Amino acid sequence: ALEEAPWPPPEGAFVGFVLSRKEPMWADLLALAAARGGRVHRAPEPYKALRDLKEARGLLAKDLSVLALREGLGLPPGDDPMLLAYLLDPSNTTPEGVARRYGGEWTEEAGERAALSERLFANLWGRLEGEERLLWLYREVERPLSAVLAHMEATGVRLDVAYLRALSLEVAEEIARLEAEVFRLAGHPFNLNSRDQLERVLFDELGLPAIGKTEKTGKRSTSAAVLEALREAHPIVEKILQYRELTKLKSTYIDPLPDLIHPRTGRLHTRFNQTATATGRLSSSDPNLQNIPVRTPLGQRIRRAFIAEEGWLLVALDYSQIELRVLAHLSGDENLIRVFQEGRDIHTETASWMFGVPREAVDPLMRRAAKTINFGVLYGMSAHRLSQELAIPYEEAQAFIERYFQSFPKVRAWIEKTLEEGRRRGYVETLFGRRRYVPDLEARVKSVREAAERMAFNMPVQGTAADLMKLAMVKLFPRLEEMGARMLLQVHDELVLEAPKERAEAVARLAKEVMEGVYPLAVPLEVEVGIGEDWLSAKE
């Protein structure tokens, strides 16, 4: 029968819990329960009952750990069947989906969530038997990383609220300028944020050619690609593109941020998820750091809003060209390995191979071509796309791509080898054995198959880079704790720390060493490090 016993539960019990909202730093803990041997213990008062647990063990353990940290408790996350499920198949991203797939039901009751957690753990543990690489990732990466991510989310980061107000005003003033010019050209006002109203203005009123159509609704598209053709010829088009860029930035990364400053901490608590992506990269939300513009002065001015506490400094560490380094390692291409061992400017050096010239004779446009292919090769960038990117003819783009593979032939071979592995086994894997299933390599529709192919050889590269970072995070954490420093943010191939100004230089030196030495590859791992009062200044 359904066994119940009073709170507190025995040691090693799985926990279940219900939040008032999904963000643990912002939620009330409504209910707390634990289960062992299928026997459920329900906490009369959940906040007091947290004190009784030595560990958060169960579904979404990291999230409960974040809320306990907020409350001044140290409840480190342990086993979590979500992490097992994600290793079995990274399409496993939510408790609901995991329950549906492997058994049971994700409900809204803490006791049931606790019992479910225990059953799923045993189930998924059994399904992993013999999978030694995935089990190594669980023990050395996923479980210990969950505790690091709890601390990052709970600690949060200070924002420069005066600066954000100044930036908001500047962007608002530019937006106002552009809409007035658009309304001047259209001869009347309308909602520039409405694609339906803009469609009418551009194509019916102004009579512009309508190239493409929308995916579902079957209307004339007003997308960037469709307007690109019209840009040079029609001023109103250019103004709309500028307008869209600024309003996207404002509404996503300027307007939301102060409301995310918690009343209790005086900090922004970015949420970090380790079971959200197909590749094994971490994701962030509230805000999504990954989608902050990387080019443009505007992306950079968002980062200036992120600041150190008074008396402290931010330390920013970035793995230079890590995906390309991983490609050199996985492919074993001797010439690409030479590019990295010569150890001068990587894109200049890549260009010298491609074009057959001494590095001194590589000009900035040749370098840009190499740099662009060094990014694009990783996912099969088309020659059409390269020709757009470089503003050169299609045939010349094709030639550049072939020049690249001629210099780096084992990269060409590795891509095909990886596709054969995917076709044979149904999955591809990273250096560490993180696995993604790739069923549509067999697809009949060429377009679907070719996207499947691109996802298939890109994942081992991105996923290896992801796990190198996560291992470094695991290794670095205890070394920072003992200096009074901490990790705050992770995005792309970058890690942002906060340290007291007196310890900042030593922390930079320690973190660089830990990151560069995390795992041996056929080429060196290189880390760029900078220190500053704000995140933009710490890029250096």
Using CB under 7 A as the criterion, what x/- string covers residues 82-111 for binding DNA? Answer: -----------x------------------
Counting contacts by CB under 7 A, is residue 300 touching DNA? Answer: no
**Is the Cβ of residue 40 or residue 373 nearer to DNA in the bound state?**
373
Contact flags string 162-201 toward DNA, x per CB under 7 A: -----------------------------x-xxxxx-x--
Can you tell me which of 244, 371, 475, 539 binds DNA, judged by CB under 7 A? 244
Least separation, in Å, of the C-beta of 216 and DNA? Answer: 3
Please give the Cα distance from 433 to 64 (Å, whole number): 29
> Which residue lies nearer to DNA by CB, 36 or 436?
436
- 257 vs 474, which CB is nearer to DNA? 257
Q: How far apart are CA 40 and CA 4, in angstroms?
A: 5
Residue whose token pair is 């900078």: 530
Q: Which two tokens stand for residue 217?
A: 């609704």
- In a 10 Å sphere around its CB, with 0-12 CB exposed, 13-18 middle and 19+ buried, how is residue 40 labelled? buried
Binding-site size for DNA (CB under 7 A) equals: 53
Site residues (CB under 7 A) for DNA, limited to 482-511: 492
H helix count then E strand count, the chain: 23, 13
Q: How far apart are CA 205 and CA 458, in angstroms?
A: 45
Sign of CA dihedral 347, 350, 352, 355: negative
> Least CB distance from residue 365 to DNA, whole Å?
18
Which structure tokens are listed for 501?
Answer: 């100004």
Question: Longest C-alpha distance within the chain, in Å?
Answer: 79
SS (H, E, C) 282-293: CEEECCCHHHCC
Nearest-approach distance from CB 58 to DNA, in angstroms: 22
Among residues 39 and 492, whose Cβ is nearest to DNA? 492
Q: Determine, following the binding rule CB under 7 A, whether residue 222 of this chain makes contact with DNA.
A: yes
Residues 6+ apart with CB under 8 A from 183: 189, 190
Cα–Cα dist 64/54, whole Å: 12
Q: How far is the CB of 111 from DNA (least distance, A)?
A: 26
Look-up of token digits 């060493």: 513
Is 241 in contact with 224 (CB distance < 8 Å)?
Answer: yes
Tokens describing residue 204:
């019916």
Q: Which of residues 325-384 bind DNA (CB under 7 A)?
A: 375-376, 381-382, 384
CA 235 to chain CA centroid, nearest Å: 36
Residues 412-451 that bind DNA (CB under 7 A): 451
Cross-strand pairs, 19: 29
Closest distance between DNA and the C-beta of residue 301, in Å? 13
For residue 34, which amino acid is it? Answer: A
User: Which among 134-142, 207-215, 313-321, 517-525 is the span making contact with DNA, rule CB under 7 A?
Assistant: 207-215
Closest CA to 99 of 59, 157, 144: 59
**How many CB atoms sit inside 10 A of residue 53's CB?**
20
Rule CB under 7 A: choose which of 214, 265, 300, 537 binds DNA: 214
Q: Which is nearer to DNA, 195 or 412 (CB)?
A: 195
Q: How far is Cα 321 from Cα 34, in angstroms, rounded to an integer?
A: 45
Q: Pseudo-torsion of CA 288, 289, 290, 292, nearest 10°? A: 100
Return the residue of 217, 310, 364, 520 that touches DNA, per CB under 7 A. Answer: 217
Q: Which listed residue (245, 345, 526, 528) binds DNA by CB under 7 A?
A: 245
Residue 285 engages DNA in binding (rule: CB under 7 A)? yes
Distance CA 29, CA 216 (A): 41
Sites for DNA among residues 449-468 (CB under 7 A): 451, 455
Residues 255-274 that bind DNA (CB under 7 A): 255-256
Q: How far apart are the C-alpha atoms of 338 and 523, rounded to whole Å? A: 9
Smallest gap from Cβ 460 to DNA, in A, equals: 16
Region binding DNA by CB under 7 A among candidate stretches 10-18, 108-116, 251-259, 357-365: 251-259
Q: Which stretch binds DNA (CB under 7 A): 139-147, 281-289, 399-407, 521-529?
A: 281-289
Cβ nearer to DNA, comparing 352 with 458: 458
DSSP reduced 3-state for 179: helix
Nearest distance in Å: CB 285, DNA: 4
Q: Which residues of this chain interact with DNA, rule CB under 7 A?
A: 93, 191, 193-197, 199, 212, 214-217, 219, 221-225, 227, 241, 244-245, 248, 251-252, 255-256, 276, 278, 283, 285-288, 290-296, 299, 375-376, 381-382, 384-385, 389, 451, 455, 492
